[PDB]
Every structure is written in C-alpha cells, then in structure tokens.
C-alpha cells in the first residue's frame, strides 16, 4: 500500500521490483511444476480447516474453483487455511477459534 | 414442508455443499448457532455466518450473496412471514427455517421445495387443512359459492393469525440433531440447557412447558454426568459437570451480594413493595426471621462467613410462605469448570443477554452480536465475567424506573389497556433506547403493577408501552404485552392491532423486527394511532 | 532411500541450518527426491478425491513436509543474502572434488542479488563522489560468518581425540573424547568437519 | 522478525564497516597529545603546537596513529585508568555502566589496537567485570515477567541490554506456550503501525 | 528455536488409540498405518490422535510411563542424584501437554500425573542455572550435558550461547 511507497526514494523502487523479480524466478524453480511458494507457510501446521472474521472491506475474495466469496466485515468464515494466511499476516482477516 | 427426520434430510445434504448461515440477535439463537457450528467443524462443512437483526437487513445480505451460494439456513427468523416474496429468490436455492416463531405462515407450509422446516410438528400446532385457504348462469350459481368460499377464508386466517407466541427452543432442536448423529458433548449440552433456560428468562413459554422440557434435558444430564458414579475422585478437576439444581430464584445472587439481590429481582421487589418506605421493613423483618445480621447480608456472597450458607436455599424458602411467595425454588441447572467457577444457567442468560444490548454503541449493528457469540466458549471466560458488570449495572437501572412509574402514577387506565411513556429528563432513559431491551422493562413493570394496583380491573388488562427512539426523526417505539397473571397462556395479540390501526389511521409505521409486536411511530401520528386503535381493539 | 528415510534426514537437514552460523553443505538430490512425492501424491488424491476421511489423512502430512521443506529453504536465502560476497567468492574458488555450498539456482540468484545491490550503490552515492573513492570492495564491507560460536551437539558417532582449546595457550589444550548420543557445549569451529560427515548434529 | 540489522563486531579485532552500533562507537571523544604542528587546520582547536592536549573521536585517531607515534600519542580516559579499575573489582554489581557508556565494552576492545603498557590489566578488568555482573542478568531476565522492568535494565550498556532483551524473548515465549497462545496466526509487522 | 517448533518436532511420538470408525490401511510417506477396526487399540503419531480426537473419532489412551507410581518415584530420583538424570521420554513436557489438555477424561488422576511432572521440570531447570553458572564463573571450554531434552535446552539456549560468545571475544582480544 501506498502508504510504504511513498516512504521509499524513487530509485529503491527499482532495487525492489528487481528483488522480487529474482526471486519469483528463484521460487518457480525448484520444482517441474511452477515449483514451491516458499512465501507462505510461516508458522508449523496444526489443523487443516480454520476460521477466520474478516475486518476491513475486500472486493470478492477467490476460491480456486471459481466460488467467490465477499468479505463484509464481522462476518466469519470456515475456509481452509492454505488460503487465509496471505490475509491473516496483512490485517484484513483475523484467526479467531485458536 | 415438515422435515420428518433430520439426518437424512436436512444435514445429509448439506453436508457437502458451502452453507450460508443468517444469525438473528438473541441467546437462544446465538446457542442454537453455537451448535450448529461445532457440527459442521467436525465434517469440513464450509459455511459462513452473517449477523442479521432485522429485515431491512436481512434483506441486504441477501442481495449480495445470492449468486454465489444456492443453500441457506435461517435460525430464529422468517417463520411467521412468507418468505419466497420478500426476498424474492430464484427457483434452485433451498431455505431451512429453525424458527420458533408462531404460528409459521401458512404458504410456508404448502410448499415441499425451497421453503423446508426442522419444526417438529408435535409442538402446538393447528395448522388448516389445504384447500380450507388455497383455491351460462350455471357460471355465477357456482361462483357464488366461490365467493363464500372466498368468505369463510377471510375469517379463518383471522382465527389462525391472531395470537402470536413460540415453541421449543431451537437449541433443543439442533441438540436433538447433534445427538442423533452421536457426536453430543458436554458443552453442546450446557448450550442446549442455556438456550432453553432464555425463553423462561425472557418470559415467553408458559411454566408447564418449562418444567415439561427441563424434565426432558435431565435424563440427558444424567446420562452423560452419572457415568462418573464412584470416579468422581479420580476425574480430573478441570472438566466441566453438569448438576440438577433445586434452587432459588433471586438473579445472580452468588455474584452480587444476598441484600442487592432481593432488591433488584423483580419477583421479591414486587411482593415487599420496595419501592416505597411503608413495606421497606418487610425487607428488614423477613431478614431478622433468619438470623442473617444486616453486616453479613451486605456484603458479597462469596466472603460471607461459611456458618451461616449452610441451609440458606432452605430457610429462605421457609420464611417466605409467612411471607406470601411459595413460588421461590426454581428448577435449574449449573456448571462447574475448575476450582473457582461455578455458573448457575441464568447468570449465563442474564450476562448474555447485556453484551448484546450494551447501551453505548461502538459501530455498526454487527458490533455487539460478535462479541456476545465470543463469550459462550470457555476460552473467553474474561468477557463473560465481563458481561457480569453490565448485566449488574441495568438491574440496578430498572428498579430505578420502576419505582418512578409507580411514585408517580404514570400508567394511564385508557379503556381496554394500560398505557405509559418515558421522559428523556429522567436519568438511565438512554439505556431502554434500543428496541430489543424494552420489551423487558415493559414486562417487569406490568409484574410490578398488577401487584401494586388496589383496584380489580387494572389487574387483568395488557399494557402498551411507548418510549422515544430518535429525536431526528422525532420517532418513538411502542411495544404490546399479554394480560399478566399466573398461568398465563403467553399468546400476544398486538401485531395484529398494531398493523390494522396503522393501516386505519394511514400514518407512518415500520414492522423492522421479527416479532410484530415492535414498531417505531412518528412523534406526531401518536394520538392519531392511539385513538383509532382504542376504538379498534374496543 | 525408502521415502521414509528422506523425511528423517530431511529434518536432520533443517535442524543444522537452523543452528550453524555458516552456508552448510548443499543438498540438491534430497530437495528434489521430495518434490517427487509432493509432486505425486498430489495426484493421486486429486484423481481419487471421492474419499472424504482418507484424503485428509493425506493432506495434513502432506502440509507437514511441505512445511518442513519450506522452512528449511527459507532459511538458506537469509544465509546467502547476508553474505552474498563471501558466498560467491568460495564458490568460484572451489577445489575440484568439493561440494558444493550453493546449488546450482542459489547461485543465479546470488549473481543477480549482488548485480543488484552494486547497480543501486552505483547510482545514488557513489556516482557523486569524487573520482577516487567511486569504487568500494565488498570483501570488507559486508561482515564474514562467525565461527567462533557454541553450540549444542548430540553426537551419533563415537570420535575419540578432539582438541578443545580454551583460549589462546597452546599448552592449556586438553584432549576430550565423545560418547555415542551424548551431549555437549562447544564451540563450532573445533567440530566444523563433524556437521558435514553425519557423526553430529547441531540441537 | 525478518529485519536482521547487521551486529556489532566491537569486541574483536576490528568493528564492522556497515554496523549502526560502532558507527555511533567510535564517535565517542578521546584524549590525545600532539607529536607536531597541525598546520593549515588550526581553526578547530594557522598551525597547533606540539605537546597539546586535544579530544578527538575515535575513528579519527585510527589512521593518525602509528608505532613511533609519529603525529600524537593517546593516553586513556579515567575510566579505564587506576583508579576505576579497583572501584569495578569491589563490587561490578553496582556501576551505572550508562553514565559510564553507554559503550564500555565496546570502546574498551579498541583501546587495545594502541599498544600502550598497560593493555595485560584493562583486557583483565573488562572480563573480571563481565563475569562479575553476570548472575545478575541471567536472573533478572529469565525471572521478570509482565512487571515494569524499565528499572532493572537502567544501568546497563549495549553489550548488556541486547542480552537482557534475549532472556525476555525466551521467557515471553515460553510462557505464551504454555497458556496454549502461541497457536493463532497473527500480524508479524502491521501491528507495529498500528 | 521457539517452543511452537519443538511442540511440532513431539508430535512424532507414537501413542495408542482406539477408534470408532472403519478404515482400511493407509501408506504414509512416513509409514503405513491401520487397518482402523471399530473398538480395537491402533498405534499412531501424535498429529494424528489429536487430531481425531478434535473431531470424536477415538478415544486415547495413557502411555505406560505416565503412571502415577512410576512417577513418584522419578520425581524422588531427580531430587536425589546431583546429575541430569535420564527421563521416560525425549519430549514429555510437550506429551503431558497436549495429552492432559485434549485427552485429560480419558487419563485417570490427570491433575496428579500434571503436578508430577511439573515438579520434575521444576529441579531439572534448577540444575541447568547451576550448570550453567558454574560455567561461567569458571571460565570452562567445554560442558557434557548429560539428558537434557530438547526443551529444557531451548527456553535457555539463545541466551546461553549468545552470553559465551560475549566471553570468548573478551577473553581472546590481547594475543595480537
């Protein structure tokens, strides 16, 4: 958000845009298909389902299936946590059922 | 349609599907959702919960929704309405209503497709039978028998929809769910105990069928906590259990102290008249019968000294009928956790049922409802003991109203009913704002009244309550409630009188809520709808 | 290599690059051993999905490996960009024979992290400088690994005859020997050949 | 939890070129006594006579130093001399290592790369002082909890705090385990804007 | 480290089960497992008796050294010798953790086991600050640390280690 863009000098935002390109070609190799997205998976599994409560405002959130799903907010989900941890770890979502 | 069996008709199908829950704002339907929820998290059921509360906005949440999902579940909303023209669906989406509403409307109930019910029809049911409400000179010889056809229908909707109450709590419904499928537990049960305990609570089931379901639950105790017969030194400590409880009827007196709890259930300040300095003493003398010193009744229960809370449930039983109340043992339930904790089902209730209504709002409607669901489970103990505080804090807020309408005689006698208002002036005014925490102080004034009164026609009229809502809109909210007495049947009967004088007067009304018995009136068309109604109900 | 011996060395393998203070040892035949049964067991429940309790026993070991995995290779790309010049260096330098510490993706991402890195100091600070000062060496910049850290080690091979210096008298070295699954406070610079041939392992 | 800063080399042979903690070091003044004149540059202090006593930063007194002591010869603040060096051997639980700081260790291990005599007794203080105050930060780190403890950690220095600030984090972190807290996924670096 | 990596490292432990559901054999790529006969004992991973256990699919059941007897005699034997003495398993704080949280009404005097091992934590800690300062006041190279488990090391490992370091750098900064 435009709020950290607006903090760096305008030749770092060459540096990043580099950075993060060498390392989604890093990341898409490890594996035959489109390797292994290291970003995510920052804590050890515990259970395979979680529940999260939205907290701000987010267009249609995706099901790879093609399901959408909107976010109004305090209004609480069951989805599976391979999806949620992108949002979690920003502040949009909220891991409540510990 | 009637669900004959739950298992495969109703979860059976859901089971593999992405559900969407609509949630009203009550304790019994945050208990029967409480349920519902720990049964679709042990199946990898996705679904997704949305707080409604009345239905402008259940209506908006199914505008944005009705795309995605094609299943729907609505707990404690939409039985006594028709439902497939308010929210005009399309033909593939499926509704399940858990509703206790009554009576269920009647198309609900001759539509076997999209509009499916989990009422167990065995709860007080009549509905009319099919073609009783559903559709040359010859032609008009016969049409003519059609239009009296036509007739008796006009008057047998008015026999059926004319008294409004409720069934079994949903969360026995969901309860009886849970154990079919054979995954019930201990804290499904207490929410089971918790959401029926509400109803008797609020005061809208009659006590025959309280005593009638707390029979039920109790073998169901018994079964899951009577297991442990002779092990019960040898059960881990921090495990709940479940107990029967014989035991008295004062609000939250094991939390508060054994004095500011007579003085505040509106069942002992009534009797003792403590509103009023000449029957004060009855407080006095009713205490010194015991032997309880006015040093220990004032403090709190928990420090009392362990001497005297021997036989307390017993000689206070006793030394009410020289008194005139037998009615002061009750029949309840109660939890203990660990080593300090030790809830008894109505202090759950009261708590609650004040997180939800907290008078100072802190954003949208959806603010509350969230954080009154977060204290049911036991990991959140903190708001809970919590909502303890407020639950104090307005029962020491209505016995202070009380007893200005009854120093000042401001329930009016205007003919067929009673009739108050409130003034903005008066301190705590504020808090009974919302239109959900009126219906209470409504039925606890009409208690205290129906005692109070000398007379031998006011005992026996139903009250009608106004309060203002905004000064904006300079609009107030009127609230109607049975005759009051011992057995009473608990069939109301204003939204009926309500919809028709509104519709006489053509002022401006709105029927928001679930139940009919709400409505918010233009500051102006008060006279102009009291008087049409007077002569209406007549 | 039973698939269930590369998970009880592929934690091996993640506990050490936790612990050591320096790039370890390099193993591309393991983390591309395990992406084969990432790669097909992920087939087989896609295919055979209409189980609903056997394909969660399935996904929730599945999400344990890959996270395994994961955290172990996260934990090599901070080793490299912290000394991304001392990684490079030692790397093109190397004696035939050696294996190697970077693989053979690391190192492209090392190549373009330091290309990176100067093209941005190339242009913001040291362009404006006088002409003499334009060139700084990232040999003594950027700060080497410290060797001379402890560590926790259970030992799995029994060694017999290692040094353990206390400070900087040669005299006062005395000679200790280790027990099989012991457990000991060294320093790593004494027991740095010992991580790279199995007979330790970093706890 | 990703923002790795680089460490302070301070206490080996020679700090760090990129660290932020021995930058601010070496800025620390230093007293010194000129071997020359100081000519064209007398305007801080045009020429400067010899055998004047002058303070200078650290880093400055690095490169103008050599064996013969060509250009100036340093002689080391008091509280590395004589007289502190008993006052730490009475009792190192005492010293405000603040006021005395707040780099002690970190200057005190490059006062050693300018040979003066007495290096054998200030590398013996520094390590009869660090073992000293010791058993007092192994337990009133690991043993302070949800308390106020700004008051525990006001006399210590950067070589200290950073190890009272690893005993914290070991104990907050054990103690959010137990109480079965350490299992929801929170915000790493949001919730320090907010 | 941090404890939420240790806790997963325990949950390899096996344990006995005993399900209420039907399944056939399963091929993990760390094992084989089953076949899951309704009312008959199974061993398993932990992850995985927990996890079914969330979900009223089993019915744990104690390991053998978490008996009530055993025990009183391990929480005397650690109070007896002055070394760290050997301990049933690698991992059992995390084992009498989770089990007594998840499972505590199918374990039989849970709030006694709980207290026991508690008090054994509690002395095995104490040697550790004394080893541990001896250590340093000493000025040692060297230290065999005899059966600490994994746990007792990491809540006071990133401090030890990081307070030696400190020691050797002052300790050799004069032979140059």
Redesign the interface.
């Known amino acids: 958000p435009n709020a950290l863009r607006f903090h760096m000098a305008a030749e770092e935002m060459e540096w990043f845009n580099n950075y993060k390109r060498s390392l989604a070609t890093y990341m898409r190799s490890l594996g035959g298909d489109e390797g292994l997205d290291i970003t995510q998976d920052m804590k050890p599994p515990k259970s395979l389902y979680i529940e999260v409560r939205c907290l701000k405002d987010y267009g249609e959130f995706e099901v790879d299936d093609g399901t959408s799903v909107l976010l109004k907010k305090n209004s609480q989900h069951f989805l599976p946590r391979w999806k949620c941890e992108q949002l979690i770890r920003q502040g949009v979502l909220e891991h409540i059922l510990s | 349609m009637f669900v004959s069996d739950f298992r495969k008709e109703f979860y059976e199908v859901v089971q593999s599907q992405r559900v969407l829950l609509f949630v009203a704002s009550d304790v019994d339907a945050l208990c029967a959702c409480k349920i519902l929820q720990a049964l679709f998290q042990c199946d990898h059921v996705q679904y997704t919960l949305v707080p409604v509360s009345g239905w402008q906005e259940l209506e908006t949440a199914f505008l944005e929704h009705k795309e995605q999902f094609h299943y729907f579940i609505l707990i404690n909303c939409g039985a006594n309405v028709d439902l497939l023209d308010i929210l005009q669906p399309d033909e593939d989406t499926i509704f399940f209503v858990c509703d206790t509403h009554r009576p269920v409307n009647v198309v609900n109930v001759y539509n076997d497709t999209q509009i499916k019910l989990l009422i167990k029809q065995d709860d007080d049911l009549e509905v009319p039978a099919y073609e009783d409400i559903f559709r040359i000179v010859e032609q008009t010889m016969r049409r003519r028998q059609r239009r009296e056809w036509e007739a008796r229908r006009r008057d047998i909707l008015f026999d059926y929809e004319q008294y409004e109450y409720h069934g079994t709590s949903s969360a026995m419904v969901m309860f009886e769910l849970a154990w079919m499928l054979s995954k019930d537990l201990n804290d499904m049960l207490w929410w089971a105990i918790v959401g029926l305990t509400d109803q008797w609570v609020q005061d809208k089931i009659t006590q025959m069928k309280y005593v009638t379901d707390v029979g039920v639950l109790q073998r169901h105790v018994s079964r899951h906590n009577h297991r442990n017969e002779d092990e019960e030194n040898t059960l881990s400590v921090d495990c709940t259990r479940i107990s029967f409880e014989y035991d008295l009827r004062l609000v939250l007196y094991q939390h508060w102290s054994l004095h500011d709890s007579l003085c505040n259930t509106s069942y002992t300040a009534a009797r003792f008249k403590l509103w009023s300095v000449h029957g004060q003493k009855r407080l006095q003398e009713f205490l010194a019968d015991m032997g309880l010193p006015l040093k220990q009744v004032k403090q709190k229960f928990q420090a009392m000294d362990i001497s005297l809370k021997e036989n307390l449930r017993e000689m206070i039983e006793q030394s009410a009928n020289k008194f005139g109340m037998k009615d002061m043992r009750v029949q309840t339930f109660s939890i203990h956790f660990g080593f300090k904790h030790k809830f008894l089902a109505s202090d759950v209730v009261f708590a609650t049922m004040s997180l939800m209504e907290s008078p100072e709002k802190d954003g949208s409607g959806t603010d509350h409802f969230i954080q009154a669901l977060d204290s049911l489970s036991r990991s959140n103990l903190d708001k809970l003991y919590h909502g303890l505080e407020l639950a104090k804090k307005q029962l020491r807020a209505t016995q202070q109203t009380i007893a200005s309408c009854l120093c000042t005689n401001l329930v009016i006698s205007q003919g067929p009913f009673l009739y108050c208002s409130l003034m903005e002036g008066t301190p705590d005014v504020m808090l009974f704002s919302r239109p959900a925490s009126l219906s209470l102080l409504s039925k606890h004034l009409l208690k205290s009244f129906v005692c109070s009164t000398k007379n031998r026609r006011c005992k026996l009229l139903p009250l009608v309550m106004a309060a203002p809502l905004s000064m904006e809109h300079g609009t107030v909210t009127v609230v109607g409630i049975p005759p009051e007495t011992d057995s009473s049947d608990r069939k109301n009967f204003f939204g009926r009188a309500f919809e028709k004088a509104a519709e006489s007067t053509s002022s401006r009304m709105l029927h928001n809520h679930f139940d009919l018995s709400v409505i918010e009136l233009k500051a102006e068309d008060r006279s102009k709808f009291l008087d049409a109604l007077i002569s209406l109900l007549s | 290599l039973t698939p269930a011996e590369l998970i009880e060395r592929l934690e091996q393998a993640w506990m050490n690059e936790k612990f050591a203070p320096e790039l370890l040892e390099s193993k591309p035949e393991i983390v591309e051993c395990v992406m084969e049964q990432l790669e097909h067991m992920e087939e087989n429940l896609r295919r055979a999905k209409r189980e609903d309790l056997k394909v969660s026993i399935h996904q929730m070991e599945m999400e344990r490996i890959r996270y395994v995995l994961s955290s172990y290779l996260r934990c090599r790309l901070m080793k490299i960009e912290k000394f991304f010049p001392h990684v490079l260096e030692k790397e093109k330098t190397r004696p035939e024979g050696e294996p190697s510490s970077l693989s053979p993706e690391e190192l492209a991402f090392a190549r373009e992290f330091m290309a990176n890195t100067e093209s941005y100091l190339k242009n913001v600070a040291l362009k404006h400088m006088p002409p003499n000062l334009q060139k700084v060496d990232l040999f003594r910049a950027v700060p080497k690994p410290d060797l001379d850290s402890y560590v926790f080690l259970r030992v799995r091979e029994r060694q017999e005859n290692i040094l353990v210096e206390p400070d900087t008298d040669e005299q006062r070295d005395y000679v200790i020997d280790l027990e099989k699954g012991s457990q000991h406070l060294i320093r790593y610079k004494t027991i740095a050949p010992l991580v790279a041939s199995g007979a330790v392992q970093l706890i | 939890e990703a923002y ?1 800063r ?2 302070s ?1 301070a ?3 020679e700090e ?4 932020l903690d021995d930058i601010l070091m070496s800025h620390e003044k230093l007293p010194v006594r000129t071997e020359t004149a100081m000519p064209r540059l007398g305007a801080f202090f045009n020429a400067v006579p010899q055998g004047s006593k002058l303070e200078l930063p650290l880093w400055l007194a690095k490169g103008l130093f050599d064996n013969k002591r060509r250009i100036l010869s340093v002689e080391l603040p008091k509280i590395y001399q004589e007289g502190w060096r008993t006052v730490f051997s009475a009792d190192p639980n005492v010293v405000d290592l603040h006021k005395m700081g707040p780099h002690f ?1 970190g200057f005190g ?1 490059q006062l ?1 790369h300018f040979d003066s005599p007495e ?2 007794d200030i ?1 013996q203080s ?2 009869q002082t ?2 000293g105050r ?2 007092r ?3 009133s ?2 043993n302070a909890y949800n308390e106020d403890t700004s008051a525990l950690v006001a006399r210590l220095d950067e ?1 200290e705090r ?2 009272f600030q ?2 914290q984090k ?1 104990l907050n ?2 103690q ?3 109480k ?9 670096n ?2 320090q ?2 | 480290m941090d404890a939420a990596e240790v806790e997963f490292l325990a949950e390899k432990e096996l344990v006995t089960i005993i399900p209420n559901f039907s399944l056939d054999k399963i091929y993990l790529i760390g094992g084989d497992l089953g076949p899951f006969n309704p009312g008959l004992p199974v061993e398993v991973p932990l992850w995985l008796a927990i996890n079914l256990k969330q979900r009223q699919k089993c019915r744990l059941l104690p390991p053998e050294w978490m008996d009530v007897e055993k025990l009183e005699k391990m929480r005397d034997h650690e109070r007896k010798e002055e070394t760290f003495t050997p301990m049933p398993s690698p991992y059992y704080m995390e084992l009498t953790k989770l089990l007594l949280n998840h499972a505590s009404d199918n374990i039989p005097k849970a709030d006694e086991i709980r207290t026991l091992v508690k008090d054994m934590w509690d002395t095995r800690i104490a040697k550790l600050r004394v080893s541990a300062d001896s250590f340093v006041r000493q000025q040692e190279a060297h230290a065999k640390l005899d059966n600490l488990t994994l746990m007792e090391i990491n809540t006071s490992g990133t401090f030890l280690t990081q307070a030696l370091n400190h020691m050797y750098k002052l300790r050799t900064n004069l032979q140059p």
Do not use: H, K
């Open positions: 790795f680089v460490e080399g206490l080996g042979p760090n070129f990129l660290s260790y291990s050693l290096n054998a590398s520094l390590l660090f073992i010791f058993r930060i192994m337990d780190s690991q070589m950073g190890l690893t005993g070991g972190d054990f959010c385990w137990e079965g807290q350490a299992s929801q996924i929170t915000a790493s949001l919730v804007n907010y």
